Structure formats: structure tokens, C-alpha cells
Design a protein around this ligand. Structure first.
Ligand code: NAG
Lengths: 49, 49
């Protein structure tokens, strides 16, 4: 079933290897576990925030 | 709860080996895991002596 790719340094761009990574996001009626950290700020006291 | 397995705990001295300490308990959470898997049955896992 399998055949190898001729990934050679002499190939034109269309036949050069490309590394593909896909980040798939699963949003279910289940607890979320992979969150962005967002950006932090410094604490300011004695002012309206 | 909502896919999270939670474990709360506390430690209290025993006056009777086969019975409970008296007075009010007030246990605190240590473990809270977003698994998404149900529990209908509980088995205590014992170590062999
Ligand atoms: C938990 O219960 C839900 C609601 O019926 C069901 O869809 C799911 O398959 C159950 N999960 C397990 C691990 O039994």
C-alpha cells in the first residue's frame, strides 16, 4: 500500500516536502481544558479599575 | 460535576477504630479533573497486607 516520496534537494518547489500541522479545536458540552492565558496587566491600587 | 471528578479531604482523630469522630467536618477540595466521563459505581481499592 505504501510508496515513498522522492524528497530530493534538486526538486523544484512544488515537489519539495512541507511540514503540515493542524490545530483542531473541539468545543463540546464538556469542560474546556486548553485555554489561552490572555495578556496580563500590573496591579493598580487606589484608582477605579 | 459537569465532567469534573472532585476530591475533598480532611483528617480527624479517632476515639473508636470502628466508628466516626464526632463534631462538624469541613473538608476542602484538592483534586478537580475535567475528564468528561460518568461514575455510577464506586469500588474501594484495597492494598493487600
Ligand atoms: C455519560 O452519560 C451521557 C448521557 O447519557 C452519555 O451520553 C455518555 O455516553 C455517558 N458516558 C459514559 C462514559 O458512560
Amino acid at each position: 500500500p505504501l510508496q515513498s516520496y522522492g524528497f530530493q534537494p534538486t526538486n523544484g518547489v512544488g515537489y519539495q516536502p512541507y511540514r503540515v500541522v493542524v490545530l483542531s479545536f473541539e468545543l463540546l458540552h464538556a469542560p474546556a481544558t486548553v485555554c489561552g492565558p490572555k495578556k496580563s496587566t500590573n496591579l493598580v491600587k487606589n484608582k477605579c479599575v | 460535576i459537569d465532567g469534573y471528578f472532585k476530591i475533598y479531604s480532611k483528617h480527624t482523630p479517632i476515639n473508636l477504630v470502628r466508628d466516626l469522630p464526632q463534631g462538624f467536618s469541613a473538608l476542602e477540595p484538592l483534586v478537580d479533573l475535567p475528564i468528561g466521563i460518568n461514575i455510577t459505581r464506586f469500588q474501594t481499592l484495597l492494598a493487600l497486607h
